[PDB]
């Protein structure tokens, strides 16, 4: 089969090696980007670790009729959108107008508006196809077949015990990191969504292979997707660990005005402060082969099987060192990678796609997630199942 | 009914212009210059809100000696005062030794040494004029404290501790007074103090104490080279001891640590969409203008002297300190108690050349810290124009 990938960044490098780790599935593998660099840099890679060839191109993902060309050129199974999120629905929009697959990972009311169309061209469009979304709506999924009649609470509980070996530094573009601290908290209990002070909301949880961990109460995008899919659902949270020397560095970063997102004028010149505070910080890239530390992610649950009470934790603990040394990434691109490179086999092997005679724009929860778990396990996000 | 040309129309020249124009007795004439005429004209319009006469504003560049001189000769002032930037005071001193005009400076705080202004000594005592250095608090009134001391209270003068905290609120959740490169060097410089003949060195905020100042308590104190402790272990004989103390607050440190650690202090240009910038410049545009934060600011400063040493043979301590209101300093003159105390020892100390108590005659000319004068009216001015000293003897 022959896969079209958009996007070449951390995460996309994890997607594009994991399937040149499966040849047996993927045999053509194109990489298009706005960057050459990195097409080529992941390129590089992948040869200097037996992954064999793939190919490289340009495109401005942003350009419809760019994307059908290339489309038309290769005629991919699947498009696999780990470009910027803002192209979502233009990458969306080239698929339907060739009836090609896609999966993106890295409001869904926009991309679910093209069920219809994509039902029409009998294509599948796959979301969230990352983590968290994406594995942990899995586990959801797969705890509502084989542990619960009725799931009555999911707390998603996402922990990065990760050392960069900076005094400070993110890894992403600086302005998510100003949203999950200073963005409402969200969450849904018994039919409603509730929203919280920033921050508001805190818990210390043990997170198995780790330890104590403060956990704050934050929106997440699956919320939303699981909420509406998973029946009988009393009560959604989603929490991320923060450490007191992160958030006191966020604090004192408000205060001053650096994580300002409107310009200001500096001698002349007009500077967004956030955008210079990505200036002063290191690239996140370049970090890649200094983390050490674990990664802990997964989904609590209570309800009911058989009219009797049962808990389930189900999680997936993942290291920085040793994703860098398979891959060449951190532990963050590789839970978000791998998973899309399983979707992608899913389609390609026909598990998700015309087995079920599927067409139109699914979560990963509404599918068939079991040949989907036993993949993860295979590519090296095997989870742990705690029930009680 | 004297002349005088203030250089400077910042925050502490606001207070020593204002404090001129309170004294009308003496200062005749108050002559205000700058490259700023905004800011003169400020301070102008706020002398004249508050009942104290008019200034005269003049531009002139400070850096440029043949402007400076032309200026002086035009007013004829009896003393100059430089509340400039401080790289411009050897260009003012060069000035005041041309046309032969007694000079004071203040607010140099902006790794110190007197050398170069020590070094215009002869030439003038040549031309028999007087250059007054650190007319401030602290160097000045601090320096006036040690003076007063071994002249009524010791002997000899063993210890001298300086210690300055600064307890004002200014409602911002973090804000300097001062351009952010001065917080910066306060942080990240090495400490530096004189015990038994030598000048040892520390790492930067690494001695610290925990120190009660009267009517604000106790405070976290912190080691730091300071400029007065150079010319106060020159002058005062028999000192074994001269450190300098300043407090910060947990909360302070702990912004300044986390700037540090994104980069925002650094003073080296970086590239940010095809432009240079310096991120702690780019800091002082973040951060609230000091002028601003006057108007909010409550609480106390107390800046003070303890000493130790031998009085009639019997062990005695002295602790000589000043207490000073943001609040009441706004409301008298619109600056806070940085400006303010920095700024009244200045006037004060134009006053004592004015009315001939600080003269150049009879082989007194030349170049002087506070210490080497007569501090007796001196330190009677300062408590009469709003800086009374309280005095602990033990």
């Given at each position: 089969?022959?896969?079209?990938?958009?996007?070449?960044?951390?995460?996309?490098?994890?997607?594009?090696?994991?399937?040149?780790?499966?040849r047996?599935?993927?045999?053509?593998?194109?990489?298009?980007?706005?960057?050459?660099?990195?097409?080529?840099?992941?390129?590089?890679?992948?040869?200097?670790?037996?992954?064999?060839?793939?190919?490289?191109?340009?495109?401005?993902?942003?350009?419809?009729?760019?994307?059908?060309?290339?489309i038309?050129?290769?005629?991919?199974?699947?498009?696999?959108?780990?470009?910027?999120?803002?192209?979502?629905?233009?990458?969306?929009?080239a698929?339907l107008?060739?009836?090609?697959?896609?999966?993106?990972?890295?409001?869904?009311?926009?991309?679910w508006?093209?069920?219809?169309?994509?039902?029409?061209?009998?294509?599948?469009?796959?979301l969230?196809?990352?983590?968290?979304?994406?594995?942990?709506?899995?586990?959801?999924?797969?705890?509502?077949?084989?542990?619960?009649?009725?799931?009555?609470?999911?707390?998603?509980?996402?922990?990065?015990?990760g050392?960069?070996?900076?005094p400070?530094?993110?890894?992403?573009?600086?302005?998510?990191?100003?949203?999950?601290?200073?963005?409402?908290?969200?969450?849904?209990?018994?039919?409603?969504?509730?929203e919280?002070?920033?921050?508001?909301?805190?818990?210390?949880?043990?997170?198995?292979?780790?330890?104590?961990?403060?956990?704050?109460?934050?929106?997440?995008?699956?919320?939303?997707?699981?909420?509406?899919?998973?029946?009988?659902?009393?009560?959604?949270?989603?929490?991320?660990?923060?450490?007191?020397?992160?958030?006191?560095?966020?604090?004192?970063?408000?205060?001053?005005?650096m994580?300002?997102?409107?310009?200001?004028?500096?001698q002349?010149?007009?500077?967004?402060?956030?955008?210079?505070?990505?200036?002063?910080?290191?690239?996140?890239?370049?970090?890649?082969?200094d983390?050490?530390?674990?990664?802990?992610?997964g989904?609590?649950?209570?309800?009911?099987?058989?009219?009797?009470?049962?808990?389930l934790?189900?999680?997936?603990?993942?290291?920085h060192?040793?994703?860098?040394?398979?891959?060449?990434?951190?532990?963050?691109?590789?839970?978000?990678?791998?998973?899309?490179?399983c979707?992608?086999k899913?389609?390609?092997?026909?598990?998700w796609?015309?087995?079920?005679?599927?067409?139109?724009?699914?979560?990963?929860?509404e599918?068939?997630?079991?040949?989907?778990?036993?993949?993860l396990?295979?590519?090296?996000?095997?989870?742990?199942?705690?029930e009680?």
């Amino acid at each position: 089969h022959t896969v079209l990938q958009i996007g070449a960044g951390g995460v996309g490098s994890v997607v594009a090696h994991k399937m040149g780790m499966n040849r047996d599935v993927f045999k053509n593998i194109i990489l298009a980007s706005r960057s050459l660099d990195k097409c080529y840099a992941i390129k590089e890679s992948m040869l200097k670790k037996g992954l064999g060839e793939i190919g490289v191109e340009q495109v401005d993902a942003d350009d419809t009729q760019a994307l059908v060309a290339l489309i038309q050129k290769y005629k991919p199974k699947v498009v696999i959108n780990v470009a910027l999120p803002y192209q979502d629905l233009t990458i969306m929009q080239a698929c339907l107008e060739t009836k090609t697959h896609y999966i993106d990972t890295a409001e869904y009311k926009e991309q679910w508006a093209f069920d219809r169309a994509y039902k029409e061209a009998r294509i599948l469009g796959v979301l969230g196809a990352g983590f968290d979304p994406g594995v942990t709506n899995a586990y959801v999924a797969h705890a509502q077949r084989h542990h619960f009649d009725t799931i009555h609470t999911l707390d998603i509980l996402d922990c990065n015990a990760g050392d960069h070996k900076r005094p400070f530094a993110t890894n992403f573009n600086p302005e998510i990191n100003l949203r999950e601290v200073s963005s409402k908290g969200r969450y849904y209990e018994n039919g409603k969504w509730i929203e919280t002070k920033p921050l508001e909301i805190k818990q210390v949880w043990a997170y198995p292979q780790i330890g104590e961990m403060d956990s704050y109460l934050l929106y997440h995008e699956e919320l939303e997707s699981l909420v509406k899919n998973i029946k009988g659902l009393r009560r959604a949270r989603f929490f991320m660990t923060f450490s007191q020397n992160y958030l006191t560095h966020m604090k004192c970063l408000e205060n001053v005005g650096m994580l300002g997102i409107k310009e200001i004028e500096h001698q002349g010149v007009k500077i967004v402060p956030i955008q210079f505070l990505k200036t002063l910080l290191p690239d996140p890239a370049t970090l890649a082969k200094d983390t050490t530390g674990k990664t802990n992610i997964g989904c609590y649950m209570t309800g009911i099987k058989n009219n009797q009470d049962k808990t389930l934790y189900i999680y997936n603990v993942c290291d920085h060192k040793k994703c860098y040394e398979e891959v060449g990434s951190q532990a963050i691109s590789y839970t978000t990678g791998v998973p899309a490179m399983c979707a992608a086999k899913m389609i390609c092997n026909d598990t998700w796609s015309a087995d079920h005679f599927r067409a139109g724009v699914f979560n990963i929860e509404e599918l068939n997630t079991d040949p989907f778990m036993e993949e993860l396990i295979k590519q090296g996000l095997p989870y742990e199942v705690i029930e009680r």
